[PDB]
């Protein structure tokens, strides 16, 4: 899993060498940033249900056909609404994982790898999830560098869908 620590070790290991002071500085940078990352993770976790429900309603109001049209890929029935809220919770949960790990590893491994294939196969529009992520960005209530950390990983997911 990609974290600043595993990335430093992989760099040294590729080269058959001990960790050098370059890699140790990188890990200390991760330790100093962790206070902001963990503040964001706690706030997103504590408000997770409201963020998920609000994000889903944002998508339904931006794309009202998703609650109107018949289809296994749509949220016009309880099955589809449950699928959608589930997916949005996956995004939020794995974003908090990335904040805790200090890198994109969790998003890369658990969600982004295979993302395009899944959206094509099940006819899910990436624009739906971009809108959900924009809602979370606008409503997490963070400021300072904790907001910077949350927005960086939200924007990372948006770019993967764009």
């Amino acid at each position: 899993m990609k974290t600043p620590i595993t990335e430093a070790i992989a760099a040294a290991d590729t080269q058959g060498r001990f960790l050098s002071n370059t890699e140790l500085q990188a890990v200390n940078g991760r330790f100093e940033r962790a206070a902001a990352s963990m503040e964001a993770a706690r706030a997103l976790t504590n408000n997770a249900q409201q963020l998920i429900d609000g994000a889903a309603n944002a998508v339904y109001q931006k794309f009202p056909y998703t609650t109107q049209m018949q289809g296994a890929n749509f949220a016009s029935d309880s099955r589809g609404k449950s699928k959608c809220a589930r997916d949005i919770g996956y995004y939020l949960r794995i974003i908090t994982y990335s904040l805790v790990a200090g890198g994109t590893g969790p998003l890369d491994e658990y969600l982004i790898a295979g993302l395009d294939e899944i959206n094509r196969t099940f006819d899910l529009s990436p624009s739906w999830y971009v809108e959900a992520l924009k809602y979370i960005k606008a409503n997490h209530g963070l400021s300072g560098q904790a907001a910077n950390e949350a927005n960086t990983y939200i924007d990372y997911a948006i770019n993967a869908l764009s």
Partner: peptide, 10 residues
Amino acid sequence: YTNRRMAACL
């Protein structure tokens, strides 16, 4: 579970 394993399954 996860999109990488779902993609492998499909």
